[PDB]
Write a protein that binds this ligand. Structure first.
Ligand code: CLA
Ligand code: CLA
Ligand code: CLA
Ligand code: CLA
Ligand code: CLA
Ligand code: CLA
Ligand SMILES: CCCCCCCCCCCCCCCC(=O)OC[C@H](CO[C@@H]1O[C@H](CS(=O)(=O)O)[C@@H](O)[C@H](O)[C@H]1O)OC(=O)CCCCCCCCCCCCCCC
Ligand SMILES: CCCCCCCCCCCCCCCCCCCC(=O)O[C@H](COC(=O)CCCCCCCCCCCCCC)COP(=O)(O)OCCN
Ligand SMILES: CC(/C=C/C=C(C)/C=C/[C@@]12O[C@]1(C)C[C@@H](O)CC2(C)C)=C\C=C\C=C(C)\C=C\C=C(C)\C=C\[C@@]12O[C@]1(C)C[C@@H](O)CC2(C)C
Ligand SMILES: CC(/C=C/C=C(C)/C=C/[C@@]12O[C@]1(C)C[C@@H](O)CC2(C)C)=C\C=C\C=C(C)\C=C\C=C(C)\C=C\[C@@]12O[C@]1(C)C[C@@H](O)CC2(C)C
Ligand SMILES: CCCCCCCCCCCCO[C@H]1O[C@H](CO)[C@@H](O[C@H]2O[C@H](CO)[C@@H](O)[C@H](O)[C@H]2O)[C@H](O)[C@H]1O
Lengths: 165, 73, 68, 226, 217, 41
């Protein structure tokens, strides 16, 4: 009941939206014979709509004055009101995947800059090396913070090209 | 929707600020144009040399940021 | 002249010229002029500039050993 | 040398090939233990997580086995905290949580201080005159009152054998506790009940028979049975 | 075993990487696969395991179909899995994952013997050193060869040639099984007795499939 | 073959392969888990 938002299970406009979608799906369904492929496709669409409307309920979702679900944003408020999985956990998973991609790219750049003509390796990928680094990045945050600790993650400003003042 | 449009406003402010401070900080020099202080504030370009140098002055950065400010407002 | 005017040929050098494209960058010494010109140290770089060139002439005071 | 190979025919990492380490099997495909100090921190973390694992697994299994036999009447691990909170002389959950968390803060601050500087807890006149026995022997093996029976005061080969046994039962306890959590989340019953179900009906009771562990397997079973 | 050997087509030029040393080397590679030696040994291992499973499956299918024709209550090779899991004490799901569990060990050992030859026979698996050592690339021997007729080089070579030829014939047999079961919806032995009953009429052109009929005139 | 393998080792081919793999993974996830919005089991 936070932010003046009713839960989707106890909401009123949520049910109106569900009935409206089921009504237009049934209106589209009534134009076809029961033993037809469009009938089966529309029945599958109606079943998916009902399952989505049921699964959006009984999960702590809140909607305000329109039946459209709202996402609780602040952690702590989301943690104490069963809304952590709305945005708190998805950004944790996204940060994991984004750090995976960044660490794999960093490892490929560092390992490809060692050999002669690194631009050829950049534009013609070493597929076994890329796949080896792809399956070795499952522990990207530990490795990243350890390179931060030993200083190999950062480059000294004396060795970095600097625009004139 | 109010939160989404406020975040879009924040995007507009941040991008216009980015253009304006890129123009201001690189006004007197840059990697492409180290001697930008000797060419004044409002000069067209340096020609097609070094890959192309159009809209390199801080005045042109301001003139792009006018578009971005118009979009933000 | 005793020894040489500039650094060892083929050795890595770091460019201290601020207006140069390769400021704080490492290049290889191709040749050092012994005549006494203003910029005798010829440095070749792996990464080309916006003009597409990769070699330049620098004086003695704008080249140092690369830090490690 | 090395105790054994986790994957025969695979290239052993260089940092683990010549390493004289207790319980080493070259299982670093991600090369996390490349640095020696990072290897020391990972070794200490493995030791603490292992001791965690065996303490929790023993507390889950032995009272659970006693209750299965009928000698004890304690509940299973997934509701014991719930019933203990609802006791008639029950300390509140927050009080116990913060008190034993503060006690952990004390021991773990001591552990961090003796890791970042070995033997630094033996500073004289610090802990009631008992600080002279707080000096650690090796990485993750403090000794002293942590080993009052003196079982580690033996031959070095016996010490390495004991360390290998400790880390092997520790890793077995990690996978055991992970299995406890996973198959309680899947089946919804105790670990002894799951063992009894696997013993009575091995084919019908497994991880693959339920759609929680592997989604979509029940649909394939229904399609095959149709 | 090379040079003037019978090729896949007379007058063809054999590839440089196909010198006839391998079993069944007829110089047949339009797509230039197995050019690299590592990819060549990968292809040899893949062909060998596909061949062995092809002859195993084809022999099982033929045995079941022959017994079904003779009178044993055996279903067709197609849709046999349904009645199999109907009568199996082991349900599906557990069965496939059980097969994967006792298959992963053998597949891991095969893969790391292919990548590292002789590395399996080091006593790591229950103290087995002389056994589990690959005599050739895709030919382990040892515990998989209890009777030692592969000690002679000539016998080993002719056995390799016979194995790869029967394996390729088994690939063709499995493809034929799938094709004429999709065309006739009958057992392969049923197709065989139909072909030997009326050879001049019962063929691939009279099943209503394969050759389409549009005008019927 | 190795010339063809280096051709597939070029950036657009591996980019197409990655795009196909990621699109197929996301599409099969969305098909077998219809309309995911709330992280619950
Ligand atoms: C910087 C951005 C930001 C902002 C504006 C807020 C805003 C808020 N937080 Mg949050 N918080 C944030 C980041 C933020 N949080 C982060 C990064 C964490 C760590 C995960 C938390 C952890 C947190 C807790 C634990 C609690 C709040 C609570 C609150 C509310 C009241 C805070 C207060 O002082 O009273 C308010 C809605 C409180 C709440 O739920 O309000 C009732 C509360 O108990 N926050
Ligand atoms: C459908 C889901 C979805 C999609 C498609 C995107 C798409 C995108 N996100 Mg977003 N994001 C999402 C959900 C999603 N996001 C959610 C749910 C959260 C949590 C609330 C975030 C939080 C987030 C952040 C914080 C950032 C992005 C960024 C990006 C963009 C580039 C990512 C990148 O560079 O490649 C993958 C990543 C790399 C190649 C380099 C790794 C860099 C990552 C961000 C660092 C991760 C480790 C870091 C130390 C953790 C702290 C982060 C720091 C901001 C505090 C891209 C347009 C980035 C962006 O736009 O930058 C301009 C960015 O900084 N996203
Ligand atoms: C994997 C390589 C890699 C890494 C580690 C970084 C890291 C960074 N970039 Mg860069 N970037 C990259 C590739 C990379 N970038 C590419 C390919 C482009 C061209 C599109 C850019 C364009 C770019 C801009 C324009 C900006 C950054 C910025 C940043 C910083 C913010 C973090 C972030 O996610 O930005 C967001 C990054 C992106 C949205 C770029 C994503 C591009 C693709 C989708 C990722 C490529 C992954 C690569 C193919 C993986 C190779 C693996 C290998 C095995 C094949 C950070 C230092 C920002 C900055 O300066 O912050 C301080 C900034 O303004 N980057
Ligand atoms: C988190 C606990 C943990 C930690 C810190 C370690 C740490 C170590 N073990 Mg160990 N191990 C563990 C659990 C752990 N192990 C478990 C549970 C098993 C049984 C499956 C093993 C089996 C094992 C073998 C067989 C061998 C090691 C070895 C090693 C060393 C290699 C470095 C390494 O693993 O990277 C450090 C690892 C981590 C920091 C863990 C990161 C966990 C990530 C974040 C999530 C993983 C989730 C997972 C997929 C589920 C190091 C001392 C080798 C050794 O001693 O060589 C010197 C060796 O021979 N371990
Ligand atoms: C606890 C960590 C750990 C992990 C994750 C693995 C994982 C693996 N081992 Mg290993 N193993 C370990 C410890 C470990 N081992 C230890 C401590 C030993 C004793 C030294 C062995 C001895 C061993 C042998 C002898 C073999 C494996 C094999 C295998 C593979 C079989 C996997 C499979 O099919 O599923 C399980 C079913 C797999 C890569 C097999 C393999 O592929 O190697 C060729 C194999 O033959 N393992
Ligand atoms: C950047 C903004 C943004 C954000 C945050 C989202 C987020 C979302 N949208 Mg939207 N969308 C966007 C942009 C965005 N989209 C755009 C630009 C378009 C137009 C092209 C759409 C069009 C669109 C449609 C039409 C639909 C969505 C849907 C969704 C949901 C997808 C969730 C999902 O697939 O399950 C979660 C999926 C995952 C977590 C993927 C798993 C990946 C991890 C890494 C695991 C990897 C798999 C595997 C285990 C890895 C190991 C194996 C591997 C080695 C092979 C989510 C709420 C769908 C929905 O349900 O809406 C609510 C839907 O119907 N969106
Ligand atoms: C599908 C069947 C073919 C599978 C692939 C075999 C292969 O690698 O062929 C490649 C062959 C290599 O053998 C070629 O064979 C030539 C002789 S002959 O074509 O066999 O007569 C000869 O030049 C030499 O051996 C070689 O170049 O190259 C050819 O030019 C042969 C013909 C290939 C194209 C056939 C088109 C008609 C198919 C049926 C259409 C109805
Ligand atoms: C650190 C994050 C801690 C989160 C603790 C959540 C405790 C409650 C819990 O597990 O119940 C829900 C079950 O969701 C699940 O499906 C289990 C999520 C498990 C979360 C911890 C990993 C999770 O919260 P919810 O799904 O009701 O949240 C709204 C969606 N964001
Ligand atoms: C401490 C611990 C658990 C402690 C649990 C406790 C106290 C729970 C409390 C209770 O239950 C009791 C006791 C009794 C109940 O009445 C009450 C409750 C409240 C329910 C687990 C550690 C558990 C630790 C685990 C499982 C660690 C696993 C680590 C793995 C798998 C690492 C693998 C790898 O790192 C390698 C080795 C090499 C890399 O290259 C690759 C990867 C894969 C990264
Ligand atoms: C046909 C085949 C492979 C054909 C490959 C060809 C033509 C390749 C040609 C080329 O490469 C060359 C030469 C050279 C290149 O330059 C060009 C190309 C063109 C690329 C493999 C079959 C391979 C066939 C195999 C492995 C068959 C396995 C069968 C099994 C396991 C059976 C199991 C059963 O389950 C069933 C199905 C049903 C149950 O009733 C019974 C049981 C027994 C349970
Ligand atoms: C690319 C990787 C994709 C994921 C791995 C491969 C696919 C594995 C199977 C995925 C689907 C398994 O199905 C599992 O989730 C479905 C998601 O709607 C749910 O499906 C079940 O409930 C739905 C309503 O909620 C009904 O419409 C379905 O008819 C019913 O089967 C069940 O929880 C379970 O059947």
């Amino acid at each position: 009941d936070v932010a003046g938002l009713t839960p989707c299970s106890e909401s009123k406009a949520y049910n109106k939206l569900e009935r409206k979608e089921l009504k237009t799906l049934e209106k589209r369904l009534k134009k076809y014979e029961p033993g037809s492929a469009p009938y089966l496709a529309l029945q599958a669409t109606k079943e998916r709509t009902q399952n989505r409307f049921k699964n959006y309920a009984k999960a702590g979702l809140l909607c305000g004055n329109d039946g459209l679900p709202h996402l609780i944003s602040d952690p702590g408020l989301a943690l104490r009101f069963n809304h952590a999985g709305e945005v708190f956990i998805p950004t944790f998973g996204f940060l994991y995947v984004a750090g995976y991609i960044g660490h794999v790219g960093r490892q490929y750049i560092i390992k490809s800059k060692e050999d002669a003509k690194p631009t050829d390796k950049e534009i013609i990928l070493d597929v076994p090396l890329a796949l080896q680094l792809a399956f070795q990045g499952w522990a990207w945050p530990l490795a990243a913070i350890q390179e931060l600790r030993n200083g190999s993650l950062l480059e000294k400003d004396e060795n970095i090209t600097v625009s004139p003042r | 929707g109010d939160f989404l449009v406020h975040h879009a406003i924040a995007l507009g402010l941040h991008t216009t600020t980015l253009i304006l401070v890129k123009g201001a900080l690189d006004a007197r020099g840059s990697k492409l144009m180290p001697d930008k202080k000797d060419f004044g504030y409002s000069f067209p370009c340096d020609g097609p040399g070094r890959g192309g140098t159009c809209d390199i002055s801080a005045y042109d950065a301001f003139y792009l940021a006018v578009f971005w400010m118009l979009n933000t407002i | 002249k005793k020894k040489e005017v500039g650094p060892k040929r083929g050795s890595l050098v770091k460019v201290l010229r601020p207006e140069s494209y390769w400021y704080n960058q490492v290049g290889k010494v191709v040749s050092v002029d012994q005549s006494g010109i203003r910029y005798p140290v010829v440095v070749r770089f792996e990464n080309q500039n916006y003009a597409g060139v990769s070699t330049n002439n620098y004086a003695l005071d704008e080249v140092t050993d690369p830090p490690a | 040398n090395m105790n054994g190979n986790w994957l025969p025919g695979s290239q052993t990492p260089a940092h683990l090939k010549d390493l004289k380490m207790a319980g080493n099997f070259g299982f670093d495909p991600l090369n996390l233990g490349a640095e020696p100090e990072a290897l020391r921190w990972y070794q200490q973390a493995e030791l603490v997580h292992s001791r965690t694992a065996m303490m929790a697994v023993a507390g889950i299994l032995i009272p659970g086995l006693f209750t299965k036999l009928g000698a004890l009447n304690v509940p299973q691990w997934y509701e014991a905290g719930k019933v203990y909170i609802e006791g008639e002389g029950a300390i509140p959950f927050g009080t116990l949580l913060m008190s034993t968390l503060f006690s952990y803060a004390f021991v773990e601050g001591k552990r961090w201080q003796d890791f970042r500087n070995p033997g630094s807890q033996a500073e004289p006149g610090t802990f009631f005159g008992l600080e002279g026995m707080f000096k650690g022997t090796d990485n993750g093996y403090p000794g002293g009152i942590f080993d009052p029976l003196g079982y580690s005061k033996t031959s070095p080969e016996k010490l390495d054998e004991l360390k290998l046994k400790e880390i092997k039962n520790g890793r077995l306890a990690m996978v055991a506790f992970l299995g406890f959590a996973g198959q309680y989340s899947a089946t919804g019953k105790g670990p002894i009940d799951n063992l009894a179900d696997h013993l009575a009906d091995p084919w019908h009771n497994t991880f693959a028979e339920n759609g929680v562990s592997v989604p979509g397997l029940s649909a394939v079973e229904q399609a095959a049975a149709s | 075993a090379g040079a003037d050997r019978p090729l896949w087509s007379p007058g063809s030029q054999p590839p440089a990487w196909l010198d006839g040393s391998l079993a069944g080397d007829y110089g047949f590679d339009p797509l230039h696969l197995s050019e690299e030696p590592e990819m060549r040994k990968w292809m040899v291992q893949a062909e060998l395991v596909h061949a062995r499973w092809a002859m195993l499956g084809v022999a099982g299918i033929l045995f079941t179909s022959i017994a079904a024709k003779n009178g044993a209550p055996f279903p067709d090779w197609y849709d046999a899995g349904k009645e199999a899991i109907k009568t199996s004490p082991a349900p599906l799901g557990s069965l496939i994952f059980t097969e994967l569990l006792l298959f992963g060990w053998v597949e891991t050992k095969r893969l790391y013997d292919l990548r590292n030859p002789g590395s399996q026979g080091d006593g790591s698996f229950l103290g087995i050193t002389d056994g589990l050592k690959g005599k050739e690339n895709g030919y382990p021997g040892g515990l998989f060869d209890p009777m030692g007729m592969s000690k002679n080089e000539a016998s080993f070579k002719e056995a390799k040639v016979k194995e790869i030829k029967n394996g390729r014939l088994a690939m063709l047999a499995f493809v034929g099984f799938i094709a004429q079961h999709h065309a006739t919806h009958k057992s392969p032995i049923d197709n065989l007795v139909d072909h030997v009953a009326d050879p001049f009429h019962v063929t691939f052109a009279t099943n209503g499939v394969s050759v389409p009929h549009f005008t019927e005139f | 073959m190795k010339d063809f393998t280096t051709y597939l080792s070029t950036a657009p081919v591996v980019g197409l392969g990655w795009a196909i793999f990621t699109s197929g993974l996301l599409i099969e996830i969305n098909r077998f888990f219809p309309d995911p919005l709330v992280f619950s089991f």
